[PDB]
Write a protein that binds this ligand. Structure first.
Ligand SMILES: NC(=O)c1ccc[n+]([C@@H]2O[C@H](COP(=O)([O-])OP(=O)(O)OC[C@H]3O[C@@H](n4cnc5c(N)ncnc54)[C@H](OP(=O)(O)O)[C@@H]3O)[C@@H](O)[C@H]2O)c1
Ligand SMILES: O=C1c2c(O)cc(O)cc2O[C@H](c2ccc(O)c(O)c2)[C@H]1O
Length: 326
């Protein structure tokens, strides 16, 4: 058969984007992978080495801060997977340097998609930080819950600008799509764990593996955390792109637990690494999982393939090669 319609993946050199490019290639797609510097071979080479990239992968230069930088890559495509997002959070002007750029970059992508005229559906990768960041945590969250931007700007917890960046970018994309009759899917992943192709530790694996290492500043994140295997997320993003009935936001979380429960699992399953018994900055006593419901996606027929055990087994190995002690 022929390639299943040219699709674009923004941020293809990244943790999520590189794997989605892989999975889209395996699924029979012609993939137009976007990067800020097609010349940085350290970042681009792992993509070109992917199975099937020689025939159906092409690399394009684009930057969310440069208007029109994406028009060429999008022209003639049937779909666009927006995965790139500004990841700088050591800013002194978070607003004009992280927030507005994130919101203006997604809207420019949406504008490019509408003007291309060939795109049938846009898949925006959101984050759980656009759902459950509020003063009083609920026991269950789904695609109808939205983070409280005002509360984020008020208390300015660690990582506040990213949550607000992504929550506004999510709302912006949805509004633009509704105003212009565009078909937009919004996929909400929690902390993503899985293999990686870069030679640098993905940030989400720093958090996921903070209990084996000693990354105590990451303990607060694991307090009440949800996970998804990177492979399941990328599969779900392809599933949602191909299902004609999909529409709107989708939660893509397959596991919810607490720091205590995770430490328990790692103790029993990895006697080799020493797991702390008391975690700095947590202490206290009663923590109950906060669940992210994926019922909308599962109802459409999607099924998760991997367990949290599968996630760490794969994260360990790809890091045991380099980046972590054995
Ligand atoms: N990993 C998780 O746990 C998780 C959970 C929920 C949602 N997400 C979302 O998944 C998506 C991918 O994130 P990630 O985990 O894979 O982190 P990542 O590896 O840092 O990927 C981010 C990508 O965005 C690109 N990027 C940054 N600024 C850009 C710009 N101005 N123009 C074009 N590209 C730019 C980066 O390319 P450069 O190499 O050139 O900087 C980078 O490849 C994000 O939208 C994230 O919010 C991730
Ligand atoms: O994007 C996300 C993210 C990320 O990209 C990088 C990183 O290092 C940690 C992260 O954690 C976020 C998160 C997970 C579970 C939640 O309950 C929540 O509110 C937020 C996640 O959404």
């Amino acid at each position: 058969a022929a390639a299943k319609g040219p699709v674009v993946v923004t941020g293809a050199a990244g943790f999520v984007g590189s794997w989605l490019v892989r999975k889209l290639l395996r699924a029979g797609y012609a993939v137009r992978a976007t990067v800020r510097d097609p010349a940085n071979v350290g970042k681009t080479k792992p993509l070109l080495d992917l199975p099937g990239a020689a025939e159906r992968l092409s690399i394009w230069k684009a930057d969310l801060t440069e208007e029109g930088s994406f028009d060429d890559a999008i022209k003639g495509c049937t779909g666009v997977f927006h995965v790139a997002t500004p990841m700088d959070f050591e800013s002194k002007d978070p607003e004009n340097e992280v927030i507005k750029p994130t919101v203006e970059g997604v809207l420019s992508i949406m504008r490019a998609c509408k003007e291309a005229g060939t795109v049938r559906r846009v898949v925006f990768t959101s984050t759980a930080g656009a759902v459950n960041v509020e003063e009083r945590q609920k026991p269950v969250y789904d695609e109808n819950n939205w983070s409280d931007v005002d509360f984020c700007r008020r208390v300015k917890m660690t990582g506040w600008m990213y949550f607000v960046s992504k929550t506004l970018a999510d709302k912006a994309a949805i509004a633009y799509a509704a105003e212009h009759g565009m078909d937009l899917i919004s996929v909400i992943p929690p902390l993503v764990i899985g293999p990686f192709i870069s030679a640098g530790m993905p940030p989400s694996l720093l958090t996921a593996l903070a209990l084996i290492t000693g990354n105590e500043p990451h303990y607060s994140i694991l307090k009440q955390v949800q996970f998804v295997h990177l492979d399941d997320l990328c599969d779900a993003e392809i599933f949602l792109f191909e299902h004609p009935a999909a529409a709107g936001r989708y939660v893509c979380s397959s596991h919810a637990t607490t720091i205590h429960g995770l430490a328990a699992m790692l103790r029993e399953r990895y006697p080799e690494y020493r797991i702390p018994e008391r975690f700095r900055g947590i202490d206290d006593g009663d923590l109950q999982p906060v669940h992210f419901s994926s019922k909308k996606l599962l109802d459409l027929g999607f099924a998760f393939k991997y367990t949290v055990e599968d996630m760490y087994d794969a994260a360990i190995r790809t890091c045991r090669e380099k980046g972590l002690i054995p």
